[PDB]
């Protein structure tokens, strides 16, 4: 059905994402049980980590495009990422390593993330009709790797320790790198322009220096979220006023403020929703005992199933509006399951969290795998900059929001935690319903501006 380099890219993406979500699924619980962080500390440090891991993606697009070439930057990013995973496994020996290891994952991801997609677009003639389907399968590849990692990582951590799980993430990256090396032939004629000139050792050294410096800057920020907050505050307000001073661009801006809300909500899956499932949900579904942390796997699961269907099955503003209503419903559903459908002991049925994740993953499809491609369509390297910047700000804000659900380590009674989660999840749902409704109010004038 598909070109030969498609399958290489599919499996490289699967394994890289497996490694990343192997870390993401266990990271908040690792902060709490292993480093002894309070839930508030863990939630804000996860917010900072995810902010860096996402805000740095623009660099890697630029480096693959103009400095080293897309194929070289895939190799470099995979190597830095694997190093980061093995470094995170090493930090169970040397705890003071953890932040440097996390910054190495961030920078690794920053270099790697944008590049396989770019490579994939180049495996097909310029408007080959199979591209829509090839990119849907690419997203499903991300989510198969993610599903395996989110399901299995917590089990592995429970039975073998974190060092083994982080090392297995590293291993997933080394097998992605091996699949790339053993299919190098498939992509000999596919790449960006620097890929085909000889490599510039000056630019390679510049990238390695910047990478290292930025590893240290990330480790610092993750250790001191209170100045990351101000760095991103002032950065946002100053790119706010650079933006404001330079009519289809005002559409990209409001679309971005809505993607911000979506990413605040997305940020809850490894933090507040994860601990909600730990604390206030039955850990038994269809008669099987599971690790509650594995519940995060319900999002990629619903994506893997829903993406072909939705591919089969207005324009830009309505799709974003529908995604926002869906995320609203996911949180109102969580709030309702706590308010009305809980046990005497304060525990709620896992089916309610299955529906929460279905809603949230529909929202993801409508908003997240759509905004970037067509925000560009409305619009350039500045908006790519400021888009990844606002999404980093969204993960910082998400960590701060998750802290309203943080449970002191001495609380043991689920009826004591149930009302906290339901208050926060319901207010998140009601605000995101308001936001979705003003989105819908604005959809017509938006659709006109896109003309």
């Amino acid at each position, epitope marked *: 059905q598909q070109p030969r380099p498609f399958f290489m890219i599919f499996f490289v993406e699967l394994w890289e994402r497996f490694g990343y979500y192997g870390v993401q699924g266990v990271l908040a619980v690792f902060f*709490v049980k292993q480093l002894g962080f309070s839930q508030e500390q863990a939630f804000v440090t996860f917010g900072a980590f995810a902010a860096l891991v996402y805000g740095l993606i623009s660099i890697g697009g630029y480096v693959g495009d103009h400095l080293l070439g897309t194929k070289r930057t895939i190799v470099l990013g995979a190597l830095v990422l694997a190093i980061g995973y093995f470094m995170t496994g090493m930090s169970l020996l040397k705890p003071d390593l953890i932040f440097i290891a996390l910054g190495t994952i961030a920078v690794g991801n920053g270099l790697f993330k944008a590049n396989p997609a770019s490579l994939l677009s180049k495996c097909y003639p310029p408007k080959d009709p199979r591209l829509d389907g090839a990119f849907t399968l690419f997203y499903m590849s991300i989510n198969i790797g993610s599903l395996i990692a989110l399901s299995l990582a917590p089990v592995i951590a429970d039975r073998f320790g974190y060092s083994v799980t982080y090392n297995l993430c590293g291993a997933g990256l080394i097998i992605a790198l091996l699949v790339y090396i053993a299919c190098r032939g498939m992509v000999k004629d596919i790449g960006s322009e620097p890929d085909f000139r000889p490599m510039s050792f000056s630019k390679l050294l510049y990238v390695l220096l910047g990478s290292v410096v930025m590893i240290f800057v990330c480790a610092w920020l993750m250790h001191n979220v209170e100045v990351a907050n101000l760095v991103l505050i002032v950065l946002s307000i100053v790119v706010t006023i650079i933006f404001f001073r330079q009519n289809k661009m005002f559409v990209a801006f409001v679309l971005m403020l809505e993607a911000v809300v979506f990413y605040i909500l997305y940020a809850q899956m490894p933090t507040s929703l994860n601990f909600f499932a730990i604390n206030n949900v039955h850990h038994e579904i269809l008669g099987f005992s599971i690790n509650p942390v594995s519940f995060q796997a319900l999002n990629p699961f619903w994506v893997v199933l829903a993406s072909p269907i939705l591919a089969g099955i207005l324009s830009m503003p309505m799709k974003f509006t529908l995604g926002m209503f869906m995320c609203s419903l996911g949180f109102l559903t969580a709030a309702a399951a706590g308010m009305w459908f809980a046990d005497a002991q304060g525990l709620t049925s896992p089916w309610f969290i299955v529906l929460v994740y279905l809603f949230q993953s529909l929202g993801e499809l409508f908003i997240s795998a759509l905004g970037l491609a067509m925000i560009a369509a409305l619009v350039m390297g500045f908006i790519l900059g400021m888009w990844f910047l606002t999404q980093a700000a969204a993960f910082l804000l998400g960590g701060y929001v998750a802290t309203f659900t943080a449970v002191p380590d001495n609380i043991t*009674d689920p009826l004591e935690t149930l009302p906290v989660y339901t208050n926060v999840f319901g207010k998140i749902g009601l605000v995101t319903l308001g936001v979705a409704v003003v989105m819908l109010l604005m959809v017509p004038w938006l659709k006109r501006m896109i003309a």
Partner: nanobody
Amino acid sequence: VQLVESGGGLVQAGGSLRLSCAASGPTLSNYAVGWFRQAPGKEREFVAGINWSSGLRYKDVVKGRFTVSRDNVKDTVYLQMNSLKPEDTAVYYCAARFGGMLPLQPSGYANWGQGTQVTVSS
């Protein structure tokens, strides 16, 4: 996923016993451990537990008499029972649930030991 209790037995009113719960594969340190007891002709009831981060929960009748503690080098949880009374006579089960909650009913716990008999004679 399989826990083994140890340390039950027969003791005179006012004596002491120490129950221990151990786990096989999963590190017990990620788990709230609750001790339940079934007395003849009654339902399992929550006696006492410790969660994954040293929060404690007790049934009112056993406060100031029972102590739950945790050794996370031996991956083991203890129930020290002092001032034992005849009404403490029961089968004692340890049970394990991931995380920091100790819910009161057996349904909140996935993993269960087989049970040790504790008899307190007057």
